[PDB]
Design an enzyme around this catalytic site. Structure first.
Site, PDB file in Angstrom:
ATOM      1  CB  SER A  91      90.363 101.435   7.810  1.00 14.39           C
ATOM      2  OG  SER A  91      89.849 101.818   9.062  1.00 14.39           O
ATOM      3  CG  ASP A 126      88.509 107.490   5.620  1.00 15.43           C
ATOM      4  OD1 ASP A 126      88.942 108.640   5.859  1.00 15.43           O
ATOM      5  OD2 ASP A 126      87.290 107.177   5.791  1.00 15.43           O
ATOM      6  CG  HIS A 159      85.961 104.155   7.481  1.00 13.95           C
ATOM      7  ND1 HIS A 159      87.168 104.785   7.260  1.00 13.95           N
ATOM      8  CD2 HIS A 159      86.251 103.008   8.147  1.00 13.95           C
ATOM      9  CE1 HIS A 159      88.145 104.051   7.767  1.00 13.95           C
ATOM     10  NE2 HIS A 159      87.613 102.965   8.312  1.00 13.95           N
TER      11      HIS A 159
HETATM   12  O1  LIG Z   1      89.974  99.079   9.862  1.00 18.52           O
HETATM   13  C1  LIG Z   1      89.004  99.626  10.354  1.00 18.52           C
HETATM   14  N1  LIG Z   1      88.889 100.166  11.575  1.00 18.52           N
HETATM   15  C2  LIG Z   1      87.560 100.696  11.865  1.00 18.52           C
HETATM   16  C3  LIG Z   1      86.885  99.970  13.034  1.00 18.52           C
HETATM   17  C4  LIG Z   1      87.462 100.366  14.384  1.00 18.52           C
HETATM   18  C5  LIG Z   1      87.416 101.873  14.575  1.00 18.52           C
HETATM   19  C6  LIG Z   1      88.152 102.587  13.453  1.00 18.52           C
HETATM   20  C7  LIG Z   1      87.576 102.209  12.099  1.00 18.52           C
HETATM   21  C8  LIG Z   1      86.842 100.373  10.557  1.00 18.52           C
HETATM   22  O2  LIG Z   1      85.680 100.573  10.299  1.00 18.52           O
HETATM   23  N2  LIG Z   1      87.767  99.809   9.720  1.00 18.52           N
HETATM   24  C9  LIG Z   1      87.502  99.474   8.327  1.00 18.52           C
HETATM   25  C10 LIG Z   1      86.818  98.146   8.181  1.00 18.52           C
HETATM   26  O3  LIG Z   1      86.461  97.956   6.805  1.00 18.52           O
HETATM   27  C11 LIG Z   1      85.726  96.842   6.481  1.00 18.52           C
HETATM   28  C12 LIG Z   1      85.369  96.726   5.145  1.00 18.52           C
HETATM   29  C13 LIG Z   1      84.627  95.636   4.727  1.00 18.52           C
HETATM   30  C14 LIG Z   1      84.262  94.691   5.645  1.00 18.52           C
HETATM   31  F1  LIG Z   1      83.533  93.620   5.228  1.00 18.52           F
HETATM   32  C15 LIG Z   1      84.598  94.777   6.961  1.00 18.52           C
HETATM   33  C16 LIG Z   1      85.337  95.860   7.390  1.00 18.52           C
END
Ligand SMILES: O=C1NC2(CCCCC2)C(=O)N1CCOc1ccc(F)cc1
Length: 371
Positions: free
Chosen positions: A219, A242, A297
């Site tokens: 991400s 992703d 995701h």
């Molecule tokens: O880095 C990004 N950005 C978004 C948010 C903002 C819009 C785009 C997507 C997203 O969900 N993530 C991945 C986050 O993944 C985790 C995994 C475990 C966890 F405990 C907390 C977070």
């Protein structure tokens, strides 16, 4: 249960903080281990991380104590402070976590890579993209274990573009610094770990295959991969799980000479993000993309394994696809790509067909239509 690695080696785990400051490197190391009779690794090792996740969810900090109650005893199947398996030089992955995550939450990936014979350095970013992280204000505080905590920064809409970009650049710098630390430890520089853990860092001397370095991340971490590759040619290929492309400056897209692999979920992606991925393509550059059918995701992070099927599917932690099935595809396809572009002499080419998305749970390229 977070799954055990599928590879032939037992897996060890430890933490390294050097230096002790907020500009230092903080990482969790997963590595091929000699022994398999140690205590498993505590998955989320301090209460403050749960306070962190609570702010990332936008709930009251009381939700954090409840998250801790539910998840605070859970371990991950890696032998804590196990000695390193000697007699072989291991390639190195540097791993970057997502927004609101931290270093411990991609153990399913890290453990699997280690079990196939990689050392994995899962960095903890100090850019305020982590739910929480910590460090020591000075030497005194480090000696007595007086931790300073840094929490996720929430942004106004006016700050998003600029601050997300400042953050991905800092993330890239933290990846390069972590690589340098590990490389200096490989070349025998003594390093006093700011955490008093019984893992002798001298074991890592002459254990890294110094040419064979890759960067991987989820991400925000997938943007971090791309930024890092454009800035640091020591990394020979990247794998973006992703990827969230928004943090990247317009300047970076033409500036990635290294092979890059996009592994996407089916449900996360959208045109604006796919278009940005496709700005990384040029006829001279090696590029690959696959999409895991029925995935979301969160299939890349460890919370896809931390609850039951019904509640996981409700919270968008699991998809239609089985979580072990999904991560097996991502991990095995990553392995074949790494073998290809680092020149490894292992058997990971058995999974070459996965790079082309040739599997009934894979889509070659992307499901997302553009224009
Ligand atoms: O880095 C990004 N950005 C978004 C948010 C903002 C819009 C785009 C997507 C997203 O969900 N993530 C991945 C986050 O993944 C985790 C995994 C475990 C966890 F405990 C907390 C977070």
């Amino acid at each position: 249960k977070i799954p055990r690695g599928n590879g032939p080696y037992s897996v060890g785990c430890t933490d390294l903080m050097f230096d002790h400051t907020n500009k230092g490197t903080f990482l969790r190391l997963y590595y091929p281990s000699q022994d398999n009779d140690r205590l498993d690794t505590l998955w989320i090792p301090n209460k403050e991380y749960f306070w962190g996740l609570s702010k990332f969810l936008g709930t009251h900090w009381l939700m954090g104590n409840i998250l801790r109650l539910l998840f605070g005893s859970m371990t991950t199947p890696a032998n804590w402070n196990s000695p390193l398996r000697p007699g072989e030089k291991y390639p190195l992955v540097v791993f970057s976590h997502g927004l609101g995550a931290f270093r411990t939450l991609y153990s399913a990936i890290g453990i699997d890579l280690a079990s196939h014979g990689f050392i994995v350095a899962a960095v903890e970013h100090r850019d305020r993209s982590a739910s929480a992280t910590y460090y020591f204000k000075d030497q005194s505080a480090a000696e007595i274990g007086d931790k300073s905590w840094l929490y996720l920064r929430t942004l106004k809409q006016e700050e998003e573009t600029h601050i997300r970009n400042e953050q991905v650049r800092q993330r890239a710098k933290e990846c390069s610094q972590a690589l340098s630390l590990i490389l200096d430890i490989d070349h025998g520089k003594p390093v006093k770990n700011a955490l008093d853990l019984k893992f002798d860092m001298e074991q890592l001397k002459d254990s890294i295959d110094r040419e064979k370095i890759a960067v991987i991340g989820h991400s925000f971490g997938g943007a971090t991969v791309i930024q890092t590759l454009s800035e640091d040619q020591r990394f020979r290929c990247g794998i973006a799980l992703d990827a969230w492309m928004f943090p990247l400056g317009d300047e970076v897209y033409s500036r990635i000479p290294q092979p890059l692999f996009f592994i996407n979920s089916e449900y996360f992606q959208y045109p604006a993000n796919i278009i940005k991925m496709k700005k990384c393509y040029s006829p001279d550059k090696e590029r690959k993309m696959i999409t895991i059918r029925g995935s979301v995701h969160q299939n890349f992070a460890d919370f896809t394994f931390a609850t039951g099927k019904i509640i996981g599917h409700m919270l968008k932690l699991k998809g239609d696809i089985d979580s072990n099935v999904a991560i097996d595809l991502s991990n095995k396809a990553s392995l074949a790509f790494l073998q290809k572009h680092l020149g490894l002499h292992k058997d990971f080419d058995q999974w070459d067909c996965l790079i082309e998305g040739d599997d009934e749970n894979l889509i070659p390229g992307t499901n997302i239509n553009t224009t």
